[PDB]
Structure 1
């Protein structure tokens, strides 16, 4: 079998994407720097940094990969929250109890998993990178 190293500087690649996208406003169904949503930001990040094709849907991203327990989160895992009007919101865990996401209140931003709003609404996590 293959013994090539894989999955790489995951944190630095996500931070590269964040550097270029920080502050981009929230727009439902958007996919550009003029405006992007939470699942769209996850889709773009995984395409551009990891070469993986994800759907632009929190509902479908919840099905991906394998489930991870909250205690076992690793950088690059998708974090899912029962938040907002439809009860669906996704971000990318970046370690140290932080996650990056396209937020409705602030656009693309880094938030803490311990912020009371997000801590109360955390639902599940998915691992996509082996």
Structure 2
């Protein structure tokens, strides 16, 4: 009974442009795993682990061709080499980017295309 796309965009609209901060988890500064953890807690009542390393072990893996809104997409980015976002369809994803804060990006940007690693499904 959940409009998943609407709820993810609700979170994004509440967090748009919040600055990136490695280890942060407030609107004063948040990182990529932090934003994903907070989204799924507040919008879907799910408790993901805190770190990107643990988040890529959650749920089940999905191929890039089978991506669905709400899947986690993972890239080789940021100072830890592990960077996570939330797929929202149309080849787009929301994430706390290291350079620009919470933003929408596209899987088809060369920067992200060449850094894409894998994806996880945590929503039924």
TM-score, scaled to structure 2 = 0.98
How far the C-alpha of 1:55 sits from its partner, in A, is 1.1
Q: Runs of 4+ in structure 1 displaced over 6 angstroms?
A: none
| Paired residues, number | 124
1:104 deviates by 0.6
Please list every run of 5 or more consecutive structure 2 residues that lacks an aligned counterpart in the other structure: none
RMSD, matched Cα? 0.8
Deviations 1:3-45 (A, max 9, x none): xxxx621100000000000000000111111000000000000
Q: Which runs of 5+ in 1 are unaligned?
A: 1-6
Of 37, 42, 48, 2:42 maps to: 48
Cα distance in 1 between the residues matched to 2:73 and 2:45 = 20
Number of the residue aligned with 1:3: none
Q: CA deviation at 1:85?
A: 2.6
Give the alignment's TM-score, normalised by structure 1: 0.93
Larger Rg: 1
- The structural deviation recorded for 1:128 is 0.3
Q: CA deviation at 1:56?
A: 1.3
Task: Give the superposition deviation at 1:110.
Answer: 0.2
Alpha-carbon distance, 1:65 to partner: 0.3
